[PDB]
Amino acid sequence: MEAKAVARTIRIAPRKVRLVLDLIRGKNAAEAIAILKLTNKASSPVIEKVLMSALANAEHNYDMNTDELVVKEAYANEGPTLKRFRPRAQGRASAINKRTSHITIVVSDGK
Amino acid sequence: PRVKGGTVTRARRKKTIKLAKGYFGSKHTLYKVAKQQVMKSGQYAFRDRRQRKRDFRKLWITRINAAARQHEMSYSRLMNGLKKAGIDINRKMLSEIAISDEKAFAQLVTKAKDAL
Amino acid sequence: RQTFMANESNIERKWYVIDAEGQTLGRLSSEVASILRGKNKVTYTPHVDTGDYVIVINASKIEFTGNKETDKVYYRHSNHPGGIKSITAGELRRTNPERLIENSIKGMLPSTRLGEKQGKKLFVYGGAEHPHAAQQPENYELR
Amino acid sequence: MFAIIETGGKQIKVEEGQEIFVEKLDVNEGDTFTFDKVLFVGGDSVKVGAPTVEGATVTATVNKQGRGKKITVFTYKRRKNSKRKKGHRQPYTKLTIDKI
Amino acid sequence: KLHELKPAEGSRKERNRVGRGVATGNGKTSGRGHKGQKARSGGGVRPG
RNA sequence: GACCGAUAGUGAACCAGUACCGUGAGGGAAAGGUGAAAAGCACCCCGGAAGGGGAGUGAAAUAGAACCUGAAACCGUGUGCUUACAAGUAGUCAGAGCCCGUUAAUGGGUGAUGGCGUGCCUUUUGUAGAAUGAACCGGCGAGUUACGAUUUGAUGCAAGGU
RNA sequence: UUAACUUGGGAGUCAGAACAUGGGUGAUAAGGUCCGUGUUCGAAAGGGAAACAGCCCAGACCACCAGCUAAGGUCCCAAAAU
RNA sequence: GACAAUGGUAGGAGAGCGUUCUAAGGGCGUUGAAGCAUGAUCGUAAGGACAUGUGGAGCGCUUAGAAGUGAGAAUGCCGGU
């Protein structure tokens, strides 16, 4: 029996997120809280704040213990961009794609 | 009345892509790239139905030649006598006799030497 | 329909040792490059490894007719600029007679994904002994 | 034993209890067919061996008559406007061998 | 009746639409040939 | 109305000659759809908040204002077969070994090894061409109508037709 | 042996190329250029000439895991005579 | 049932599939249409069905009529990546 907590349209990029989500997949949930609190990147407290919602929606309202939980799948899809420009030299202008992302953490308990 | 371009550019560009599954990379996804590989994979097959018939004959002759040399006779001495000693009908797919029953293949070699 | 295709566990490949003394170089290497491809047997198919392991002893007494001992040369290159190196078939008999036969045979073998595996069924020795007595060969009277 | 029959302009090595592709004959299903032209009949001990040997006939029994798989025939030529496209289903006849 | 009408036999005819294929013949050049004056849109010289 | 149905029909179904460009005359796009009825998510829980997951309204929220159906390109996560001694317009025909079980028919996926094999148009006496064109996917995008002329096919009468 | 003239409807083409063989021009030079007759490419796949529109054999209605032959070939790569 | 033909670019002639709309006859549809998605099916070709899933109200078939009637390329035009 398994829970999830999806955060969507977070301001950060979708390729810089899934380096950190690659790192904690298939690991115990007691460690993976404290790996995201030692890495010095920019998407670590954002992923951390949504992992601590799949660990509170698995203890509340399903009533399963948070000592056995394991991260089954954790994947970052893609949300809509925000096309803003940048005035570049000789009368030109280049398009800058600020991308956003969807983050989904799914915990499990081996059953 | 305005004929809108309907659902015929869906279906016509599926039944080419669905013929082309199993190809590398983008040759199974895009239309234009998997189209013009389907036109060549029905052209290569047309000269490979004609070539299959004559490259299984470059194999049956190889087995017969590797059967008469152990009875100390050439191949060209073997499909000489069996047109001339007997009227043993011209067959090379039936080099299956030489593989299966060596005792059966020996009496033909007896009849070829007998009237040549 | 009714054809036969010999595969990885439908054949055996037994051993041959051939005395390579008293006979010329490219008249020998045709009754070796056909043993390695397996054209002495029925149940020959393409695309698999039939054939027989061939051992060659007395590499020191192969022959040449005419001035091939002085006017047959073996050019090789080295991919640096100005690197072609020459070696003749009179100094190759005396120095390294194990290579001389081993390139007289591997020029007669097919397209080189399987013709690399067919060529490595061939053991070329210089003297009259061989350490492959544990594999039970026999003498092959080649024509 | 075995025997060699000649059916559709080509020769088939057949033994017993065996099912075959043969190109089209003129029989309905459930019938019985007879090959009056056999070539090399006999296994190891049984031998005749002859040019179109006489006396021995081989029977059959038809299981179904139908059509093979559709073989789409395409042919184009480059730089030009030439193309063709066809499709073909060669009709066969399946037998079952009862006696030599 | 009116739910079943047949024209006169041999009276009617299809019409040739050019440029709409490659195997219909009249395609990729519409039955004019290659370059020239009278293969241009509105070319062809005055009669006589 | 044998006229269009949101790249269509007005430039304009949205508060259009309006954002915006120009000193000026002047140029000028983008926009539509919850449900039958707002009954538009009370209350608990992680959160600074966003955004979530339960409980609830509803025929269905896998219709929650990014709101009907939701294609391809392109980015992902999972798994049956496979690949680290080989020179590949990437396919084709011959074929072992492995995992499966359909609209039931001499089946499907994968592919160790062998043979043949220098993309598609356009212009050329002749293009693999190191001659031209396309990044990819999706829409839109070219022999039409009028009044005459001539020949062919049909049909009504026919020294008369209209 | 099986075409050919006549009357009317509809277009295309007017840049040609190598090889063989009679000659001009050039230097008994060019894969040169300009004319006469024939073939192939143009608009033609297939086997051969190692690769190669024009050279040599031969004109593909589609299917078959049958057969006899042409140009060219028979030790091995590569089918057939060490 | 005999004997015959069937490579083909410019180009001439013939025969067909499909798409939107209208008229007439018949018919399926909330016990679920169109559209989309997967499949090992049928015809000489373009193309036709049928079987579960998603979808939520309109659509095919036989004969004839009329066309804004078919997209791989125009350094094509707007949108997405």
Ligand SMILES: [Mg+2]
């Ligand atoms: Mg290049």
